[PDB]
Structures are given as structure tokens and as C-alpha cells.
Amino acid sequence: MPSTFFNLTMAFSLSLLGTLMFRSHLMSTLLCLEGMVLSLFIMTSVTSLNSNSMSSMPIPITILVFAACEAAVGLALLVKVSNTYGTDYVQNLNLLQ
Amino acid sequence: MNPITLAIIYFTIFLGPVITMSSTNLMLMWVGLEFSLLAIIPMLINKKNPRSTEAATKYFVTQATASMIILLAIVLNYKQLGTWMFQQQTNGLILNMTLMALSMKLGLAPFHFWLPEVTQGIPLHMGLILLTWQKIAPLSILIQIYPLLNSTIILMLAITSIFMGAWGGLNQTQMRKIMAYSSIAHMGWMLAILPYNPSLTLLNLMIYIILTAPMFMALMLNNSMTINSISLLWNKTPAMLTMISLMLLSLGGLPPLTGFLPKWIIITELMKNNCLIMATLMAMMALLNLFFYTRLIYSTSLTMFPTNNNSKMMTHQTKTKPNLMFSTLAIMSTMTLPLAPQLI
Amino acid sequence: RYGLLAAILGDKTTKKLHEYSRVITVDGNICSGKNKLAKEIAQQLGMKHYPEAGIQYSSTTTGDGRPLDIEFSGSCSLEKFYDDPKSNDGNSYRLQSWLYASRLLQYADALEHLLSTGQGVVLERSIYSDFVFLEAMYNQGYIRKQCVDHYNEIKRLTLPEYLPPHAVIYIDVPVPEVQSRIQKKGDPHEMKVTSAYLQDIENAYKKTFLPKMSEMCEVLVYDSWEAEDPTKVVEDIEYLKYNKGPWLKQDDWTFHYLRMLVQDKTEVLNYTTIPVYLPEITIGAHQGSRIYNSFRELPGRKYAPGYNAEVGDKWIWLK
Amino acid sequence: DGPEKNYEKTLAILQIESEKAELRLKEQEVRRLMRARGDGPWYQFPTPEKEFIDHSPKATPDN
Amino acid sequence: QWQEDPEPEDENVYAKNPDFHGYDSDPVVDVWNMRAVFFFGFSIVLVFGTTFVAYVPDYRMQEWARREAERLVKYREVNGLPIMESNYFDPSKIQLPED
Amino acid sequence: LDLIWLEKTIPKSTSTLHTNMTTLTTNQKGLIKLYFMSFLINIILIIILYSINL
Amino acid sequence: MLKIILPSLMLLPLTWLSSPKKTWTNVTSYSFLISLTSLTLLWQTDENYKNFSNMFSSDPLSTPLIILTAWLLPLMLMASQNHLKKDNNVLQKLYISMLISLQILLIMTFSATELIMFYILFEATLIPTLIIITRWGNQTERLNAGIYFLFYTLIGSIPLLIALILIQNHVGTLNLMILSFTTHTLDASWSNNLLWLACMMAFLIKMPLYGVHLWLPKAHVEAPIAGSMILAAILLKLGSYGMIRISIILDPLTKYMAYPFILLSLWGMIMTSSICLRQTDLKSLIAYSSVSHMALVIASIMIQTPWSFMGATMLMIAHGLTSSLLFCLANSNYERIHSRTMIMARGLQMVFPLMATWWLMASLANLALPPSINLMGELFITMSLFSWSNFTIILMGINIIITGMYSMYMIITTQRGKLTNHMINLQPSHTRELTLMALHMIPLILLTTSPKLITGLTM
Amino acid sequence: FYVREPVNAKPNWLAVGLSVGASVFMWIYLIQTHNEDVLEYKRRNGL
Amino acid sequence: MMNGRPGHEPLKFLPDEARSLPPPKLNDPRLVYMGLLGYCTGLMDNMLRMRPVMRAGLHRQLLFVTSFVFAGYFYLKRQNYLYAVKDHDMFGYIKLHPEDFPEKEKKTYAEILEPFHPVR
Amino acid sequence: ARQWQPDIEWAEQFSGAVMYPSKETAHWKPPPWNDVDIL
Amino acid sequence: PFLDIQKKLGISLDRHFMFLSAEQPYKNAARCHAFEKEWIECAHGIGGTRAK
Ligand SMILES: CCCCCCCCCCCCCCCCCC(=O)OC[C@H](COP(=O)(O)OCCN)OC(=O)CCCCCCCCCCCCCCCCC
């Protein structure tokens, strides 16, 4: 974990760099967004497991349950967008200028 | 909306901030933030106009990544202290993350780009909720953790917001976006005093809520998203011209009205704490905010813009009244100043 | 009041609908004998008949109902429309814009009666059949191109929200014929109507109005002889299937919101007052302020309905 | 009523204002001290509650 | 061009109401808006006010000081004391810095 | 000195300084990628602000 | 001092509740009496200041003004009964109330013990004034003028807000009484050299200094007559009253931190006086006359010698009354002429015999004719300025020669020469116009009989 | 009068009685609270 | 700030300790202000809804003037307590930590020599 | 002579999606009043 | 926290499990339970500024 918690953390930052620099398809962000939730879920589960802190295992899952719906909302917005613009491409999302 | 759905959503949009405030286990504070994100998105696309889908998809991505960053801070803390909550010992970077993240959900400073755009594509009503019952949640999390956050960053985000809000507002002519910009600014003052006297943040918020809620129900009484639209207020409903005038000058800091107190006591508290550098620059550009407020004053009240013949038709018909809240929140806001000592 | 509360507890439009809860708008030329037909159609099927919406369809609907002074009603003359076409002041466009606002009020009042009572409504000409006058006016020197754009913008902003006419009974007495009818009638001005105007109006009905509403709503065109016999047409209206038409998706929880709109006249025409400053439409601050101080000072108007004592309202001190 | 009333009234106004002034300054010094000292009722930031520490006999023997 | 009124003319209020006093168009309001303005304006402010202001007694003590001087100058001269000694706060009271 | 020099210097200049500053800060594409990247820059600078003042 | 104030507040209920036809007389008649109650404050039988209560006080410097502030509300409401008599009966009752609030606020500001009470009330007076100027302003440019009047005062105001909160922390109370009897001696640092500028600058702005006075010419030009009277008579003097009470602290720095302003004002006095010499708009010329005669005041509230101060107090009250008189008669010409141009309307004495006598006396008050408080004032500021440096007489000597020239030019090209051939025939003078004037000058004659009352705190 | 009979033609008599009656309950509780309060204050402290 | 104080009532409005403080006089200028603040709210409402301004809703006018005032007594009652706690807290500390707040001594103006800057 | 109330032209400036129009910003056009677009 | 509706209502839905020394299921003591106790019974009554 000393260096196994640095890989996961950098994974979250590499996923951070991803969600923040868009490119074309919006799905790739959402998908990326999810890459973080996995990294957070893995790190939370890892430390809870090596702290033998069983009282906290509820959290690793609450994180996933909330993250799943969060993503559900995200995809419905995505479907709504390629119903209004025929694509998920972000450039289209420039009307509010 | 099937009234049942309306209830579930509205309950969530309301259980969302309330769980955040009540809980101490940060995790439970995070899901309170998460529920607010999920509940607001359905209402945002109610018209389902092409502009709306854009609004929600931006609001959601901005909100979601910030939510993930807030969770990372809680996850990191869990390994630097077994506790699920920030403590004196917390690594400084851990707290700064929470500031940036929470300053994105609240939309302060260099993350102020999403708010003006989502405020532009959502209805006036959902505009209010997106501006004022969604700021309570994140601010609660910050106010709780104030003893630990950095005085430097907050100040920079504070000053930046004040400037960005002011400068942005000067050019805007769409009302929804003028308000979005004002909110960025006021939000700035609020976060300036958080490290020093959180109790004043809660005043600079309430007053902002007691000022903005009447102002928006005014914009929608005639549902005018344009200044030109609010300028013909004199024909559509003449009485609100008087209070719209005072509330907007109250939103800016002019001295007789209630709006001065938040700026005055924040400046008094910052000078008490010696930031006479920071406080001075903030107050000065705060004066820029009044310029765009008064430019609107000019169009809506002090000068009468030309109207359309078809307006005579709308006069004939009885005007659906403004709720009582307008009055009670217009007066308590435009003139409570004589009662400042007890407010603070 | 009507609101979610009422809707939540019953007060559902769907429960109040029936074979004859429909909207039938009969449209024709300058004189198609359409009033007569509309009246009868409405009676035969037991539906409310809404008179054509004139420059004053709003004062009658609001307050005393007594004809307002011309300047209070937007200073529009159909009379001056005819005697002075392409007028410097543009009374013709102001007449058309007020007419669109009047039918917007009439259509909305009609929808409110339909969803509340459940009774159907015959509205003669409608917002849907107003464009033919403007198309003919632009085809003529009556209105300039931008004037057209301003009407189209108001139409695009307000008309889509309201549900379409269920069916659109139509009469088609030709322009030569109508010109004859008008001349036989005594109206000194109506008779100065350019034949071309009549034709252009007719065309915009056939080239645009009937095909365009035909796919979204049932269309029943009848010639002069057919209309004289409403019964004939009533039959057709009854055999109508109202199969197509956006009306099919109007669930109760959807009607509620539409009702709450028509229930609010101030919104129905909210976009009718959009701040687009074309010169004819502008009242002007000094003239507009005076007309307002004067319209607002009329008895029973200086205060909301129920609160002005002049007309005999009482209990104001407890209302 | 006289010169006596204003002279005595002005001295009373000065005593209230002098006493208010001394207290306002002492507040600022007390508030500087308790923030850094943390030895006074104000600025007593929270730490977990021992009311949840589980002092029960645990399974392992070193708890 | 847009719709608006033509500039209104300003009436010669002196054509009707040839006794116009400048306050209001209808004559009785005018008369009663000068009969009360000359009165409350001149008759009981410039007159009663100046009367009261004139009778304020010994304003800022300058009527008292021309006597107190006279008895001090009476007392100082007869007893041989300097009329205006050159230090006011006595030197004895003043503990000067000893450096 | 009245009119132009004392109106171009104090009253008008301050008018222009701002006007120009709003023009640059408010001329935004409206595209999300651009905006977001700016969030990236911010995270970077704040990361540093903490780092260097460790 | 709640009779000069509470009865004032009650005026507002009277302007609203009263009949549309009788609204004007109830308000004007009652505030004339409100002025009579104000005269009671003048009864000072000993040198000690009358501290009415904790928040409200009146000392020699404020008392001469509170009475003027109460006095002009009657007059303001009498000068605006003509224009504003074409309104809808609810625009009037707003204008009357706006005028009423100005003196309620101004009476309190001049009668305030706590310096920040001054600030809150000080900067509030802008709200009523901006409405009077922008809402009823005749010209297309009042939106602009309003902006200039709000920003110049506001940008100056926030520095004072920071400074006064700053001294409260440094000393511990902003109570003018204590601050005076307590040791607040600045230490000539670079920072203090800024504090001093922070406190004085907001006051120096509304007291037009040569550098920042462009707001006043623009504001009075399009402002309605009542707003122009208020700005010249009471509003500008708010800046002077502030400089007198604020320099009790910041005692050491002004000895050397004043040179910049003093020179700005005395050279400013000459140039502002001179441009009056060729300005076509009469209201424009009176406004620059106001800048120059107020530039003398900032040069006496900075030299800080006993005589300066009461020279200042004499001139401020006197010039206040004179300026209004000039702005009031300018309006009477403007309403009949319908143009502000000085060149038109030549020869009026031929057609308006008396208004011309009022014009002549107003001009003689404008220039320093000797049996007038106006001259006593300048004679005193002149003396001290000479004491500061004998050379000052040269600059305060070019101003006197120029002041004589523009004051008489206003009389020579407006009230003499051949009559204008046929402008819209000029209807005779109303009795209101003439009284509004008489009400300005009869007090100027009475005050000149006993100058002691308006001599200031120093003497 | 009005073509569309004003909805406010005759007072909502419930809205009077809960508006009037509510306010009179407020006072009787408020004035009660004060005198009751004064007492406790007086006795809580010596007097 | 004042939160975290010993004995803090976690969600209470005004702890009974506030019973010791004097009750706000019903005519306290502030409560009277709240009253006027209220009447105005009422009048304003009538205006925005286009009703005779003063002669209408005479029942509402009462609800307003009587709601605001009711609120006041019970709010001021608290804010008064909060301020009173502040002294209890402040004064106490000055003593418990006496050395930090010593009573310095002030010399008579005779001893003190303040530099005299001539005005000339 | 009556106070100058704003004419149409004074009103015009306040239209447009940005008050102080930039070089490229001016190219933009005001948002649709209905909040719904034609694309 | 910001609004303590939990202490007031007496409920403890969010406090029972905030630290490693809280009740672990089946009383399986966590790791570092020997210390967190010692570090929170110490900082109890002493505010943070002096728990640091
Ligand atoms: C108060 C603060 C400022 C307020 C300004 C606005 C106030 C308006 C409302 C109140 C107006 C009246 C009250 C204020 C002025 C009071 C003046 C006054 O009381 O005069 C006193 C005078 C008696 O003189 P006395 O006071 O005894 O002088 C002291 C001698 N040791 O009593 C009299 O004898 C009156 C005599 C009247 C006739 C005088 C005739 C001589 C006039 C000489 C004019 C010389 C040329 C003037 C030139 C002016 C410019 C052209």
C-alpha cells in the first residue's frame, strides 16, 4: 500500500486529467469519470481491508451505489444530447455562449 | 410531471442539502452532495429545449467531477487518520482539494464558467434553486471545516470571484446571467470571511438569499430574461418598479439599505484580522457591481423605455399576483439596516 | 383557483371529456358566411360559439366588457385598414398584431372552457388561420418584410404551446364571389377591399392553411352551398374520427399544465409583448405612459377586480 | 433647563462611550488570545467523541 | 416612425386665472397656497425666528467674557499681578522630563 | 485641461480600462473542453501554491 | 434633536396621505415651522457642545447648517411646484418625499456624533439625489450625469469606510467627542500618509477639488432646480463638514500632506473662476462659480488656522444661500426661455423689473461686496492664506478680479442690453418665483447683521 | 360589474378568521410571555 | 466562535439561562421598528397586487404588523442572550487569564510630553 | 419641453447578447426569447 | 455539525462509526485501536487548538 496506494492515486489523477480535457465524444468523459470511481472504490476497500476496519466496509459499496445512479443520470443526459444533435460530440454543446 | 415524481425529486433536492448539514461523517456529507446533483438534473430539463440539454450536461459534468474530487479527499483522509472526517492533523493538500472541489460546486472564481451558462438555459424558477438552495449544501461543508482551510487560497478565490463576477456582469444583458454573475461575486465575499469568522458567512448568505429570491420572482412576475424586457416593467406592473430599484442597489453595497451590512461587517472583520490589503481591493471592485446594477436601474425605473401596443392588451387582463413572499422578503431585505446589531 | 392541488384531487380534464368536447375553427375569406355556419355547428353539437376576435375581443372579455376607446384598445382600425392601405402610421400592421393578440386571448379562453367545462368550442378563425391576412398584406404593399418577420416571431414563440384545432371546417367561396358579397353589404370601407387582397387571402388558405393543418388535424372544406346547410356539415363533424393530431398524447397530467397556462392570460400573451422594437408596434414612452394612466384610471380598473369601489365593489377592507 | 443639564448629560454620554470603547478593544485582545491559546470557551474546535470508543472486551487480546 | 405624442405646449396660465400666483392652476388652491406660504414663510419664521435668535442670551459666552475680563483686569491690575501671565498651566504642575 | 485632459485621464480612462477587461474575460467560446481545461490549469496552480508554500 | 427629525419624518406620511390638490401647501407650510423648531438649537448660552443624546449632537459647526438644511426643504418644494406640476399625482408625491428625505438624512448627517453614522447617512444622500437628477432630469445626458455623481462619490467613499473602521480598531470608538479628547497622533509613516488621503479624499471629492470637480458641472446642468439647489447649498457642504470633524484625528500629517491639495485648490480657484468667464450655459457658469468658491474652502480647512475655519463656516453657509439664489433665478429664466443659453434672453430688466433686483443682489453676494457675510468669509480665508505664505494673495488675488468679472457678466448679458426681439413672449413673474428668491436673500440680509451665529467652531 | 365575476367579489371568510384569529392568538401568547418572562427574570435574579 | 462553548445547547433557540436576562420591553424601539417594517410589507403587498393600498386587507395588515412583532420579541430575546453570553465569556477570560490583560497605568498629562507641532 | 424619455435608439444598444460588443463577440446574436432554438 | 439535528433528536445514525475504535462487528478489534483511544480520550474537553 505505501506504493500500491500511489499507483491507485495517480490512476485517479490520470483519470482526473482525462475528465478535464475533453475531446469529441462525451461518452469518453463519462467513461473516464467512472475510472475514478473504480480507483476510489479500490483505494477505500484497500485501506479499510488493511486497517481491519470492518465498520467501514459499508462505505466502499455506498460509494458504488451512489456512483452508479450518478452515472445513470449522466448517460440519460448523453442519450438526450444525441437525440437533439445526433451525436454526443461536445462541440455541439455551445449554445449557451 | 407526475405529481409523485415531483415529490420524489423535490424531496431529494431537499434531503440533499439537509443530510449534508446534519451529518458529521463526511461520507454522509458527500452523498448529501450527490443526492443534490441527481435531484437538480431532472428539473433543469423540464422544457427539454435544445438549450436545456446543454445546460444539464454541463452542470452534471462539472458537478460530477467535483463530487469525485471531494470523495477522493475523504478517501485520502481515511488513510491519514482512520477517521472519516477532517481533523487538525489533516495534510494541507487534503483540505485544499476540498476547497477547490467545493469551490467548483459552488462555482467560485476560476471555476465560474459553468454557472453563468447553466443559469442561462434554465427557467427563472429553477434558476433560483440552482443559485440559492444548492449553495447551502457545499457552504455547510466548508463552514464546518473552516478552522482547517487555507487563508491564502480562499482569499484568492474570493478576490478572483469578486472580479470575475463584476467584470462578467458589466457586459451581460441577459438577466439570468447578470444574476449568475452577481451570485459569483457575493459568493466570493462569503468565502473571504470563512477562515476568519464563519458566522458572517451565514449572514452574507442569508442576506443574499433574502435579496436574490425577491429579485428573481420579480424577473419572472413578467418572465423577462432581457433588460429591455424588464424595462417595460413600468407598463406591465408599475408598483414593483420602486422595490426592484432598491433591491438591486441593495444587492450592491450602497449604505442606507440592508445590503451594506454584509460588506460592512465582512470589511470590519477582515480589518480586525488585518487584511486591509485584500479587503480594500474587494470593496473597490464591489463598486463595479453597482455600476451594472444601476445601468439596469436606469432602463427599468429612472428612465421609461418605449413599449409595444400589444402591451396595452396585457394590462387589460388581471395580472396574476406576486406571492406574498415577495413583499416580506423585499422589505426585510431593502430595509432592515436599522436592526443590524441583532442580525450579526 | 385551479392548480396542482385541485388537479391532485380530481379536477382532471380527461375525466371531463366527451364525444363533442372538441375545437372546431371554421375559416373562410372576407365573407364566407362562416359565422352562420359556426353558430349552427356549435349549437347542433351543443358547443360554445366564440365570436370572431376583433380589435375589442379583450375589453369585452375584461372588466365592464364595454367597448374600450380606440387608443385604449391599441388604436387599431380595420376601417382605416381598407381606406388607407400602406399607411404612413401603419395602422394595418398594428391592426393585424392586435388581432393576433385578440385570437390568442380567444383561443386561450376557448381552451380554458374546453378543459374546465368539458364543452367543445367553435372559434371561427384562429391563430392558426391568421397568417393568411399577413401573407396577402406582404404580397401587397400593405406590410414590409420585417413587419412579416415580427409577426412570424410572435407566432413561433406563442402558437406551438397551445394544442392544434381538432378539425378545421372550411368554406371556399371564391374571390369573385366574395367581392360580390362584400359589395352587396353596406360597409363603406369593407367594400374598398382590393380584389387582389381577397385572392391572396384565399390562396394562403388553400396553398398554405388547409394542407398544413390537414396532416395535424381533420380538415372539412365545404363550398358555399354546403355551408348554408350546417346540418350537412354537422354530420361530417360527427363522422369525424379525430384519429390523427397531437391531441392524442394529452394525458391528464399533461393537460393540467396547459390548463394552468390558459388560466393565466398574462402569460398567454407574454410573448406578444416581446421587446422587439419595430416602429409600428412601439407605443412610445410619453404616449404609452399617458394611455396607461388613462386606461388604469377607468372605473373598476384602477384596482384589481373586486377591489375598486367605483363600480360597486364592497368588503375591500377585509378582502 | 440650564448649563448644568448638558454638561452632566455630555459627561454621561462620554462615560458610556469610553467604557464601550475599552471593552471593544479588550474583546479583540481576548479573541486573539483564545484563538491561538485555545484555552477559553471560544474557538474550541471539535475532536471525535469518546462516547463511541468501544472499550468492550474485544476478540483479540491486545485490542 | 414610431408612435409618440407631439411635444405639448406650455399654457399661459396667466390667460385664465389672471390673478395666478404661480402655485397651482385652479384659483382657490393658488390663493390658499400663497396665503399660507407668505405667512408661514415670512410672517412667522423671518419675524418670530429673528426675534428668538436675536434674544438668544450671551451666545457662546461672549457676553459673559467681557465682564469676567473686566473683573480679572480689575483684580489683576489692582493687586499688581500680570494681566495675562505668560504661562498658563503653572510650571510647578508640569513635571518636565528631567533629561 | 477641463473637458478632454481631465476627463480622458480620470473619468474616461477608468471607463475604458474596465470595458476592455470585460471584453477579454467574457469573450468565451462556450465549448466545454476549453472551459474545463481551465479547471485543469487551476488545479495545477493551486497544487503548486500549496507545494511551494508547503 | 428629534424634533428637527421626527416631525420631519412625519412629513412623508403627510405628502402621501394628503389630498392631491392640497399636498403642496400642507408640506411647504409644515416644514417652514419645522425650520422654526430647528432655530431652537441656536440657543447656546455656554461654549460646551449640546450633546442631545448618545447618537445625536449639535455643535457650533453643525447648527448653522441643520437650520439651512431645514430651511431649503420649504424652498425646494416651492421652486419645483412648476415643473413637477405636469406630473401624475404620484410622481409629485414621490418628488416631494425625495426632497423631504434629503434633509431628514442631511439633518442627521450634520447632527451625527459617530463618524460612520456620518458615512452611512453621508453616502445615503446620493440615493435621493440621484433619483431627483436622473428621474426628472430634462436633458438626454442625466443618465450620464447620474453615473458621474454616483461613481466619483462612491470610489472616494469605500476608502473612507476602510479608514474609519481602521481608526476604530486603532483607537476603539468612532465617537467624535472621544476621538477629540483622546490622543490620536498619526506618525508620519508612508502608510499614515495614505490614511490621511483615504479620510480626506472622499470629503474632497463631493467638495469639488480642481482635480475631481467635473462631476458637479455635469450634475447641476441636467439636474432639476430642486436637485441643483440641494447639491450646491447642502450636498457639497457635506464634504466640508466632514473635513472639519475628521481632521481632529490625523492631526500631524496635514501640516505637510496638505500642500498638494492647497496648490491644486488655489490654482484651481483661478482656472475654475476663469472658464466661468466664457461658458454659454448659465447653469454651467454658476456651477464653476461654485467650484471656485468651494476651492477656497478646501484651502482653509487645510491651512487650519482659527480664522480659516470660521472663514470657511461663514462662506459655506453664505455661498450656499447665494448659489441657490443664483440657481433658482437661472431656472426662472430657463422655464420661460426654454433654453439654458446665456446669450439669448438679453434685456430682461426691461421686462421683468424686480427679478433683476434679485439678480443684482445675488451677483453682489456672488462677488465680495463688503457689508455681506460672503465678503467677511473671503476676507478671512484670504488673511490666513496670506499667513501661510504672503505669495498666496497673488493667486487669491487673480480669483477676486475674475470673480468680479463673471458675476457682473451674468448680470450684464442676461439682465441688461436690448431686449430679445421675440422669444416666446415672456410671461410675467409669478409671486412664487419672487418669494423663492426673497426667502433666499432676506435670510442673507438678516445673517449679515449678526455674523457670530455662523462663525464656526474655532471662534 | 365584471363579465368574469371577480374571484374576490365576496371575502374568503376563512382567510379572515385564520388571519384575524391567528393574530389575536399571537398577542395573547406574546403579552403573556412578557409578563411571565418579567416575573421569572425578576425572581430569578434577586428582584 | 461562540459555538463549542461548554454546555452549548446543540439545537435550542434560547437556553433557559436566558431567563436570567431582562425581557425585551414590548415597545423597545426595535420591536416597534419591526412593527413598522411589517406594516410596510403589508402595504407593499397591497400595492404590488393592485389593491387600495391602505384600505384593503385590514385583516392582513394586522397579521403583518403582528407577525413581525411577534417574531421580534422572541428573536430579540435571543440575540440579547447571545450578546450577554459574549460578555460572560469575555469578562471571565479577562480574569482567568489576568496577566495577559494587565491594568496598565496611565500617567497624568503633566508627566507625559506630547510633541507640539505648530500650525503656523 | 418634456424630460427626454429614451427613444428607440437608446433602447437598441441594450439588445444583443453582450452590451459592449467585441470584435468577434458582436458576430453573435441575441438568445431566442422562447429559450428554444431553430437548429 | 452545521445543523445538529442528530444530537437534538438524540439519534446517532452517523456517529457510531467514524473512527477505527468504534464498535467493530463481532468485536473484532481494529488495528491501532490501542492508540486512537489514547488519542481521543486525551483530546476530549480540550479543543483542537490544544489537541494539536
Ligand atoms: C442660522 C444659521 C443659518 C441659517 C440660514 C437660513 C435661516 C432661515 C430661517 C431663519 C432666518 C432668521 C434666523 C437666522 C438669521 C438671524 C439674524 C438675526 O437674528 O439678526 C439679529 C439682529 C439683531 O442684531 P444682534 O443679534 O443683536 O447683533 C449682535 C450685536 N452685538 O436682528 C435684527 O436687527 C434684524 C434687522 C433686520 C433689518 C436689517 C437691516 C440692515 C441690513 C444690512 C444689509 C447690508 C448689505 C447686505 C448685502 C448683502 C449682499 C448684497
Ligand SMILES: Nc1ncnc2c1ncn2[C@@H]1O[C@H](COP(=O)(O)OP(=O)(O)O)[C@@H](O)[C@H]1O
Ligand atoms: N388579420 C386580419 N387582417 C385584416 N383584416 C381582418 C383580419 N382578420 C379579420 N379581418 C377582417 O374582419 C372582417 C370580418 O370577418 P368575417 O367574419 O369574415 O366577415 P363577416 O363578419 O362579414 O362574415 C373581414 O372583412 C376581414 O377582412
